[PDB]
Ligand binder design. Structure first.
Ligand SMILES: [Ca+2]
Ligand SMILES: [Ca+2]
Ligand SMILES: [Cl-]
Ligand SMILES: [Cl-]
Ligand code: NA
Ligand code: NA
Ligand code: NA
Ligand code: NA
Ligand code: NA
Ligand code: NA
Lengths: 445, 445
């Protein structure tokens, strides 16, 4: 039946995918032709942030629209016996429920990581009200399992011989789109890829190993990524396993884009591609950015962000205004014609910015006390306002100030040379840490 | 040269050895004939405690004579990047320095676990003043390496093909005894065994596998401890790998006892055998005691304790008075004719008790906030006074009270039925936690 309907929202999030990985973000080794077509059909953000530098807190920021420091989940949820933390459906109106109240059918395909108690699982996605819960984790994901039968995903009881998980999750996405084509839907495609341990179909791995040898020389893939390298990790850039994993994601994104075109949903569907945190050490490519996952340096929090809404968002646009994972909740509620129902939202609606509007500066905040990883040298808090970023570190206590426009690699600390700017941002950070009751870092006495 | 000399002190400590493992503690599967001879030549303690339920804090209690909660090391030291904690030689007069000031030459053979920074290692045993430092760890021990070349022990640069670590450490003990026979010595024999991952010489493993099949039936060692069981762990009691590991320790203890007899040092040497914490889950045997390593239940803190001093300590005695790892510092200083030099000691000299004296009751305390393991259900504090033990748990907050004489397995909580005793011990525990500035547990908000 033809007639206007609220737009579908498809939120595709990769796990641990670095800012330097996509073709449109400058990578020449990986191949991401479908995501580069999505970029050509939409708006590419160069200064998009996860609200945390590890998995669970960024997922919490997306589902609650609140600072991870305010939620009290600032680090990943470990196995059940190592935490008492979980996201409680009675404490938050989650993004899926806000969209349900605005007329949407909701689904999650994949990773939740907001509850690691599987005995009761009172904070799993079904408990949060998702209408469809497809291949979510049934035990602690840990280093993962990417081939059927999926040891961490009991609910995928059926599958083909040696099926690859990214391919399964993308097929489930297309099927969800087809089953729900007559009504507004929200689909959270929460990929397990590219989380370690790296694993990809053999023929994709051999493709990128041959490409690596063409780039670096004969026998070099075997030299750096042979039998003896069990995790397929190294300090070497261009990771054939990551490239293979990313090709599977990219092909799956192409299948979703094709499904939208075939079902005649492409004109009335918003497609977002994002990542939950920065590239992982020894696996991921954060380009010139400093460090990666576990750090509040730019490499750990800067993420790929493509938003497409054909005919509403100008294609092949590049937006450098800073945005974060907190902004999806209000943006999607605006697209859905909904309004907050008393719940606090810590981000901002980007629909006016996506439509070509102007961006007012606002401060952005992070807090990483590393409650789970215990990474004492990474424990830090940060504020960005305009081009300046201030980090406070707790072990070796000190402030670091970067001008990210002139120093995007955070190689030249300005805190001593710009003491007034340092103090101005320090005051914003101190005030914010009070507002959110920021958890103290786990250090000695 | 003949003439009286202060007694030698040999402190032999197994890693993660359970109360239920030794022959003299009732085990009929393992074979510990040399340690059972040591028991027949000395005093066996049935109610001996580690001051903590994991490695580093108990080692801190021994070297400083202070409560782990007062030191601020109540959980194991993880890898360097996960901690800022270490034992500082400028904060404590350690037991080796107190004995050096009383005329002893000192040595450590083996595990330290009081500093995991190997870049500088300002808290390693050499920095603490040990005269000889033999085969201590040069990197984070983690799941260990028991065959030469020892991946965690660079300083054992020389060794025989496939040498086993327990055999090396016991040979180094005998050689240390022989080299220093003319003067008083303190030897800290800090074994890496029986820490997981379990590993023992093949012919010892096959001996205990055949013994397991005789006990349990044909093919049962292969059934429970075959190729498919990589860590050699199970819920099954009688672990052939643990039995093999313990035979190597026992044979080594016999070699030390023989070396003392041959060098004519046996009459003037105090030999202690102890363990740093309770048996490990799926590996160790804590007999009827509750739980094990990581818990403040009796299985995690009750340890084997044999003390021999021929002609001073009556042989084949059994002492049921409670004693802890805090008591070694004052006991050894009394044996050495030394006196504390301003340093606080939290235990008590047992020399009068070892000589046949009477034991006054005193309260004993534990604090386990699990700063490193993050084991939320194990987080607890405890006080024992007389036969009563009170535990306070922080997750699922509650008090548990046990009468350990009538309920040594801690199977019948009395806290509701004996409210006045519960309150009396609760007050001692609250006062103690204040005295030592007990670290709060790592829980949610
Ligand atoms: Ca992640
Ligand atoms: Ca231990
Ligand atoms: Cl537990
Ligand atoms: Cl680090
Ligand atoms: Na839990
Ligand atoms: Na809710
Ligand atoms: Na599998
Ligand atoms: Na460290
Ligand atoms: Na000292
Ligand atoms: Na080795």
């Amino acid at each position: 039946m033809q007639g206007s309907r609220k737009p579908n929202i498809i939120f595709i999030m990769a796990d641990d995918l670095g800012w330097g990985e996509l073709g449109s973000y400058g990578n020449t080794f990986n191949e991401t032709p479908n995501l580069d077509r999505l970029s050509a059909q939409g708006m590419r953000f160069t200064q998009a942030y996860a609200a945390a530098p590890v998995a669970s807190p960024t997922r919490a920021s997306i589902m609650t629209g609140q600072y991870p420091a305010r939620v009290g989940i600032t680090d990943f949820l470990p196995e059940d016996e190592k935490t008492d933390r979980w996201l409680d459906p009675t404490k938050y109106v989650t993004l899926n429920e806000a969209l349900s109240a605005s007329g949407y059918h909701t689904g999650i395909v994949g990773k939740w990581h907001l509850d690691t108690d599987f005995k009761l699982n009172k904070g799993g996605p079904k408990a949060h009200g998702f209408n469809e819960v497809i291949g979510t984790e049934s035990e602690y994901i840990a280093d993962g399992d990417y081939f059927f039968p999926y040891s961490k995903i009991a609910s995928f009881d059926k599958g083909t011989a040696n099926e690859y998980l990214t391919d399964r999750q993308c097929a489930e996405a297309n099927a969800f789109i087809t089953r729900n084509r007559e009504k507004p839907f929200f689909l959270y495609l929460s990929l397990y890829s590219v989380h370690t341990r790296l694993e990809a179909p053999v023929q994709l791995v051999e493709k990128y190993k041959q490409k690596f040898d063409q780039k670096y020389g004969t026998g070099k893939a075997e030299q750096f990524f042979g039998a003896n390298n069990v995790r397929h990790e190294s300090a070497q850039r261009d990771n054939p396993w990551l490239a293979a994993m990313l090709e599977s994601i990219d092909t799956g994104v192409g299948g979703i884009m094709k499904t939208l075109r075939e079902t005649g949903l492409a004109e009335n569907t918003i497609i977002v591609f994002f990542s939950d945190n920065g590239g992982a050490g020894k696996a991921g490519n954060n380009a010139h950015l400093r460090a990666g996952k576990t750090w509040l340096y730019e490499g750990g929090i800067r993420e790929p962000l493509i938003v497409s809404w054909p005919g509403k968002i100008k294609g092949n646009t590049v937006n450098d205004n800073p945005v974060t994972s907190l902004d999806f909740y209000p943006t999607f509620l605006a697209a859905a014609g909904g309004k907050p129902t008393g719940g606090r939202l810590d981000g901002h609606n980007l629909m006016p910015l996506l439509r070509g509007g102007r961006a007012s500066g606002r401060p952005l905040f992070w807090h990483y006390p590393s409650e789970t990883g215990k990474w004492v040298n990474r424990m830090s808090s940060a504020v960005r306002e305009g081009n300046y970023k201030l980090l406070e570190f707790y072990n070796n206590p000190r402030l670091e100030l970067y001008d990210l426009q002139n120093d995007p690699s955070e190689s030249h600390n300005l805190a001593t040379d710009r003491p007034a700017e340092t103090a101005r941002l320090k005051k914003l950070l101190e005030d914010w840490k009070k507002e959110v009751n920021a958890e103290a870092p786990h250090l000695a006495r």
